[PDB]
Paper text:
In the present study, we describe a new artificial binding protein scaffold that we have named [name]. The overall structure comprises the characteristic cystatin family fold of a four-strand anti-parallel β-sheet core with a central helix.
The [name] scaffold was derived from the [name] consensus protein by initial N-terminal truncation to a 92 amino acid sequence which we refer to as the full-length [name] scaffold, or Adhiron92. We have determined the crystal structure of the full-length Adhiron92 scaffold by X-ray crystallography. The [name] structure is compact with limited unstructured loops and this is consistent with the very high melting temperature of this consensus protein. The thermal stability of the Adhiron92 and Adhiron81 scaffolds was tested by DSC and both gave identical profiles with a melting temperature of 101°C.
Author numbering: 32 to 110
Write the structure that this text describes.
């Protein structure tokens, strides 16, 4: 259920960014996603989130190891 997983990872990206940078972006939706095999899976996401009420676009890179309870935000930045 790829798109179901993709949305979860995009929400995770926003949550992790918020926790890491003391921010409060509000996830809206995923708009682009690339899923690439590496050691584990690498996700290149484009998503919309609200920053103080204004919708903005962001790119995120998320690393997942599905054989264990592991997920990790590598990069998160405005488009």
């Amino acid at each position: 259920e790829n798109s179901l997983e993709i949305e979860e990872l995009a929400r995770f990206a926003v949550d992790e960014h918020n926790k890491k940078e003391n921010a409060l972006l509000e996830f809206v939706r995923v708009v682009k996603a690339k899923e690439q095999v590496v050691a584990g899976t690498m996700y290149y996401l484009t998503l919309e989130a609200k920053d103080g009420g204004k919708k903005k676009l962001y790119e995120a890179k998320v690393w997942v190891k599905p054989w264990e309870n592991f997920k990790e935000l590598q990069e998160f930045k405005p488009v």
